[PDB]
Amino acid sequence: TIESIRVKNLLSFDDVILRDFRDINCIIGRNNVGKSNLLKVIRYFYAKLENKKVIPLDFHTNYNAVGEITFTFDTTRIKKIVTSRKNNGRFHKHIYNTLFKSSSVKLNFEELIARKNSTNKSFFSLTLTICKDDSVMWSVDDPKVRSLLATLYPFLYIETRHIDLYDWNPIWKLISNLNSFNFDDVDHDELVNFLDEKISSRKGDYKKYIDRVVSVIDTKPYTYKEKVINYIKVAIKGDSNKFLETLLHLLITLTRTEFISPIVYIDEPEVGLHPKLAESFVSNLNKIYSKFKKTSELSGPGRYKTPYPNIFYSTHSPSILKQTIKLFGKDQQVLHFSKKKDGSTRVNKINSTYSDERFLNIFSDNEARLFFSEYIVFVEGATELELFRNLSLLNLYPAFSLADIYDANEVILANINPGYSKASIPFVIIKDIDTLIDYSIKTEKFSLRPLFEKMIKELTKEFDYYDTGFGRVRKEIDLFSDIQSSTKKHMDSGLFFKRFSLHNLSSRINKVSRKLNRYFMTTTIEGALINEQSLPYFFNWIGDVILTQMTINNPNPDKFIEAMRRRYNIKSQVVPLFKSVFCIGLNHPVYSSAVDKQALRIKLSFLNYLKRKVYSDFNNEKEIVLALRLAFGGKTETQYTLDKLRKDGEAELFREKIKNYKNNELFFLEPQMTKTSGWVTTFLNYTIEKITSEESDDDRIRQKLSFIFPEIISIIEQASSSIEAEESSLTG
Amino acid sequence: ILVDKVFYEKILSVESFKENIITQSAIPKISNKEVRLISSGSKIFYAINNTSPHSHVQLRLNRFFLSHIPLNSAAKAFVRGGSYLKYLEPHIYGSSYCRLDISSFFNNISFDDVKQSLSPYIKDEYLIGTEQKLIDAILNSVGYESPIRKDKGMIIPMGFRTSPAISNIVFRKMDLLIQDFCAKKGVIYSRYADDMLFSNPRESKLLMSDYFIDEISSLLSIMGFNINQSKYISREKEISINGYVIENKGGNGSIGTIRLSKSKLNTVLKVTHALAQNIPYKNICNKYIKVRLKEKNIKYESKKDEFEKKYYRDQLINYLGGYRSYLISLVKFHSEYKCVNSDFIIQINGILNDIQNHIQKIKKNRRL
RNA sequence: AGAAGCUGAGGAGUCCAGUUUGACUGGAUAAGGUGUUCGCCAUCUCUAGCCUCAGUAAAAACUAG
DNA sequence: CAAGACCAATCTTTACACTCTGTGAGTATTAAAGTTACCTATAGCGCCAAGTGCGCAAAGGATGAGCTAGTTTTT
Structure with a gap:
């Protein structure tokens, strides 16, 4: 039962301290050299404990002259056992004379009683x-102390990548050192006589055979360990994953009646294993752990209160981490190594205990994958996933592909608590401006959400002294508090703003909240996708959709086209002809040259009609963008959507015009108009392909993408710069 | 790091000495008309003008040059991440304690030692023609010819910005020698500025013998340093250093504790008692604290009885906040290392609660 | 030798000790009690143990729950 | 008062010269390729010229405003 391990100026350590160990300590990270160095340090310490000649470790720097390894052992249970008046034995008195003798004879009669005999930990x-x-x-010049510490706190190391299944030495070592039997009382002669009596035709034949064999094979006598191993082997009835399971089960079972607490390290428990196999391994370990637990009402024979040994895992599999987090719960911890700026191993604790039972039950592989990341981007909706995970977009930016994007709500973020592991796993939380400020039409005033109030309270820091450069934050907080009323004016019947632009306020709040790892977008994802500079590309995409997806419903295209041209007017009745001729289909048949020409002419006429109507009904060219980004489930300027406007009963004319456009001409686009439909991916791919065809150089296409899409490209560039700043530390 | 001609041309001297480089003129030394002569007891502090070519060069050297040369871990002063608590922490494992001091640490630093120490990190070349070298040009911005100490020549004076880094770089060799000597004896050694602390975890009288003092003096005589015989302390099982008490009853595998004396906290307790007894803020800020608003500091009369009150309130709240920061630094040190007595933790928790309540009361009274 | 010592300049009242009939000099208020390695140390309790003016450069750690 | 104990790295290796192609007895005797080769970065705030600066610290409107600053250690 070790409590603290400290390493100073050795290998890749400057000053590293590990404490607060649990039963199921787990080690993860990118810097495998740090894990190897820690294992080497532990093995070197335990080899020097047992007086073995080994090579000393190297120094991190040569400007020092010492390297220190410090170990702290919790000698509380042993003290309680030995100091009791009930236990009178050689071993107990020897342990007292070796461990607790020197430190107790220097105390008076006041500290010993009622001050170190109630709840203290030694x-x-x-x-x-x-x-x-x-x-x-x-630090202690006594080999007996080191020998007793080594024999009371043994260390076991298991490597699964290179393990021989034909060797059972660890099993026999565990069995021999965890027994409460004295094997010196079994005389050889009586056992030989018993065996001879059991199998013999003439009395004494087996004894004579054994004597003749021994007289020829005379070698060194058996040691005690060899004798006990032979006795165990003759007593029992028989002799990668299975070996590890057997070792763990034996370690758990045999320590329930002994005061020896081993420490076990296991490297790569999941090498060459199915994920189900690793999950079953963890589950079986947990079941055996819970079988021997005597807590509260759970009592009876076979249940104990003896503390369990410490187990360390080195794994690269999210499945094992997920199972450990879900099953053990409060009896486990997660460690992260990483590096430093100049190059040096660190040790940090990653939060893995959750107070929400729903989160633990719904825990899946994505949450475990979040652990094995160097930059996490948290988003709310499902459109952000569709935008940031586009393959073509990430092809041109080989720096945002190293970050993982996760959908989290407020409760999910609170349960995860990314701020605890801030130095190990950098993260950014992207939200919308609507989450902070709410605007109303009937009442001409803004309002502040409780999240904004919580952010202001967190930013506000009472119990502090003056510091230059901190008064600006206070002034910004005061302005945010006083902007509660912020009387303004809305034109176009509660649709736009007179002069606010929602941009200066967004920039100021972003500057204030950058210290909290937050970014508030000016508009929604759909707002950034289609802007004033992306109208030609959106129109081209719509035209391509019309050209490709629309096909003739009738199996015979020529006859149907001729009949509908002779039945419906080509110019005045173009809309009914388009509705009754072209339909969306997965398969696109190839028609005749004349039929293809007629279809192309009809499609061109429809495109001309739609563009003329669009440019005639709306003039300022901004209401076009507003209608486009509002029809695709979005809000603009006033933070209002279709349902919110309908409930508020405002802008009747605009809503009626949008409804007419949707139900009269753009009937085919309707299925690709709901949330989470797939238009984002298609539009992004089409735009990227067009720009790639137009411009060949990577710099030119990146510049054009930045010009067309400012906000998302700015976010990607900022994330890439943040990753590049910390790339050296978070990379093995 | 290796500083060459271009590095000094662009980074170290961007605008202050750019005029003297193109004209092929030697970089001047610091004259007696640009340095003050502040006095405090038997100590002389040299203060340079805030608007001078050498001040910017010193700041640039401190930030870009005198921050990458490796040091020794035994030095825990004037280094990022170092603190007095880290200077006292390693000695909790010892049973015998010894303390030593260096007499005139900054005044006894030889200039040639500084030049030799800084030579490997500066390229050997002529900065200005064939008259002045780069190393000499850089070193002319850190020394000073003291009029009162003309016998010793020119030395690095206390009060300059680059003095502590130079002192650490110079004393790295002595720190290595002393650490090597102490490792063989099994003695833990730490240094803060010019104070050395030694701890022995075994039961022996080595730290109470004259042999240890003789060995330390012999080691320090290589570079011309001396110990102060009036500040030599050697004790067992308990030591007090400026109100910090380190205790260890002894025994194999025993861990000591660190606490603060009652006299260390006397002033804050007196301030809290006076504030709880409704004592005027003027008397509290003048008697207990040494903050006083002189009438000469007043610039414009404007209104009279509104700036003194707010000044005293701000000084009181700043003092309380600073002491709260110190106490919670102690608490964080305990959380990191767990070497603080539990009763002292309870006492400081109570004191922190009382201080926070007093600060809230002061703020409420000011608002009313 | 050597090394410290010290941020200074003071003043009012009171006490002690010395010289001295009349003034001067020296020491002194973060109090009292207890234990001590006798340390300018630790610990405990109050009602918290005098006032005025000058001077105050540099580098690090700390704004927790 | 003097005194043994006077850091690490400074880029890294590798290797005979002559006329003779096998052998060499200086009072004080390394050096030239190859492969790298490292990073330093900023302070009150706002404004317009957008960082190379200017103004101002009363708004504001170009020189009345008004104007504090933590603890501890070394020292």
Whole structure:
């Protein structure tokens, strides 16, 4: 039961301290060199404990002259066992004379009673120092203490990548050292006589055979461990994943009646295993762990209160981490190594305990994958996933592909708590401006959401002294508080703003909240997708959709086209002809040359009619953008959608015109108009393909994309710069 | 790092000495008309003018040059991440404690030692023609010819911005020597500025013997340093350093504790008692604290009885906030290392609660 | 030798000690009690143990729950 | 008062010269290719010229405003 491990100036460590160990400690990270160095440090310390000749470790820097390894052992249970008046034995008295004798004879009669016998925890500290001349020194100059500590807190290391299934040495080592039997009372002669009596035709034949064999094979006598192993083997009835399972089960079972607490390290438990196999392994370990637990009403024979040993895992599989988090819960922790700016291993704790039972039950592989990331982007809606995960868009920016995007709500963000592991896993939370400010039409005043109030309270810092450069934050907070009323004026019947633009306020709040890892977009995703500079591309995409997806419903195209041309007017009745001729179909048949020409002429006439109507009904060319981004489930300027406007009963003419456009001409676009339909991916792919065809150079196409889409490109560039700043540290 | 001609041409000297480079003129030294002569007891502090070519060069050297040369971990002063608590922490594992001080640490730093220490990191070339070298040009911005100490020549004076880094770089060699000496004896060594702390975890009288003092003096004599015989302390099982008490009853595998004396907290307790007894803020800020608003500092009369009150309120709240910050720094140090007595933790928690309540009361009274 | 010592200049009242009939000099208020490695140390309790003026440069850590 | 104990790295290796192609006895005796080769970065605030600056610190309207600044250690 180790509590603290400290390493100073060794290998890749400057000053690293590990504490607050649990039963199911798990180690993850990108810097495998740090894990290897930690394992080497532990093995070196335990080899020097047992007086073995090994090579001393190297120094991180040569401007020092010492390297220290410090270990702290929680010697509380052993003290309670030994100091009791009931236990009178050789081993107990020897342990007291070795561990608790020196530290207790220097205390008076006041500290011993009622001050160290109620709830105190006893600690033992051992320090190992390596000098510049390859000299090794101990803080305690007594080999007996080191031997007792080694035999009371054994260390076991398991490597699964290179493991031999034909060797059972760890199993026998665990069995031999976790028994409460004295095997020296079994005399050889009586056992030989018993075996001879059991199998013999003439008395004494087996004994004579054994004597003749021994007289020829005379070698060194058996040691105690060999004798106990032979006795166990003759007693039992028989002899990668299975070996590890057996080791863990034996370790858990045999320690329930002993005061020896081993420490186990396991490397890559999931090598060459199915995910279901790893999940079953963790589940079986948890079931065996819970079988021997005696807490509260759970009592009876076979249930104990003995503490469990410490287990460390080195894994690269999200499945094992997910199972460990879901099953063990409060009895586990997650460690992250990473590096530093100049190059040095770190150790941080990642939050893995959740107070929400729904989150634990709904825990899946995406949450575990969030652990194995170097930059997380949190978004609310499902359109952000469709926009940021586009393959063509990420092809041109080989720096945002190293970040993972996750959909999280307020409760999900609170449960995850990304701020705890801020130095290990950088993150950014992207939200909309509507989450902070709410605008109304009937009452000409803004309002502040509770999230804005919480952010203001967090930014406000009482109990502080003066600091230059901090008064600006206070002034901004005061302005945000006083902008509560903010009387304004809306034109076009509560549709636009006189002069606010929602841009200066957004920039100021972004500057204020950058310290909290937040970014508030001026508009929604659909607002950024279609802007005043993207109208030609949107129109071209609509035209391509009309040209391709629209096909003749009738199996015979020529006869149907001729009949509908002779039945409906080509100019005045173009809309009914388009509605009754062309339909959306997955398969696009190839027609004759004359039929293709007629279809192309009809499509061109329809395109001309729609563009003329669009440019005639609306004049300022901004209401076109507003209608386009509002029909695709969006809000603009006033933060109002179709349902909100209908409930508010405002802008009747605009809503009626939009309804007429939807139900009269753009009937084919309607299925690709609801939320989470797939128009974002198609539009992005078409735009990227067009710009790639037009411009060959990567710089030119990137510049054109930045010009067409300012906001999303700015977000991507900022994330890429943040990743590049911390690329060296978060990379093995 | 290796500074060459272009580095000094662009980074170290961007605009202050650009006029003297094209004209092929030697970089002047710091004259006696640009440095003040502040006095405090038997100590002399040299202050340079805030508007001078050398001040900007010193700041640039401190930020870009004197921040990458490796140091020794035994030095925990004037280094990022270092603190007095980290200077006292390693000695909790020891049973015997010894303290030593260096006499005239900054005044005894030889200039040639500084030049030799900084030579490997500066390219050997002539900055200005064939008259002045780059190393000499850089070093002329850190030294000063003291009129009162003309016998010793020119030294690096206390009060300049680049002095602590130069001191650490110079004393790195001595720190290495002392650490190597102490490692063989099993003694933990730490240094803060010119104070050395030694701790022995074993049961022995090595730190109470004259042999240790003789060895330290012999080591320090290589570079011309001396110890102060009036500040030598050697004790067992308990030591007090400026109100910080380190205790360890002894024994194998024993861990000590660090606390603060009652005298260390006397002033804050007196201030809290006076504030709870409704004492005027003028008396509290003048008697207990040493803050006083002189009438000469007043520039414009305007209104009289409104700026003194707010000045005193701000000074009181700043003092309370600073002491609260100090106490919670102690709490954070405990959380990181867990080497603080529990009763002291309870006491400081109560004191922090009382201080926060007093600050809230002061703010409410000011608002009313 | 050497090394410290010290941010200074003071003033009013009171006490002690010395010289001295009449003034001067020296020491002194973050109090009292307890234990001490006797340290300019630790700990405990109050009602918290005098006033005025000058001077105050640099580098690091700390705004938690 | 003097005193053994006087850092690490400074880029890294590798290697005979002559006329003779096998052998060499200086009072004080490395060096030239190859492969790299590293990063330093900013302070009150606002404004217009958009960072190379200018103004101002009363608004404001170009020189009345008004104007504080933490603890501890070294020292």
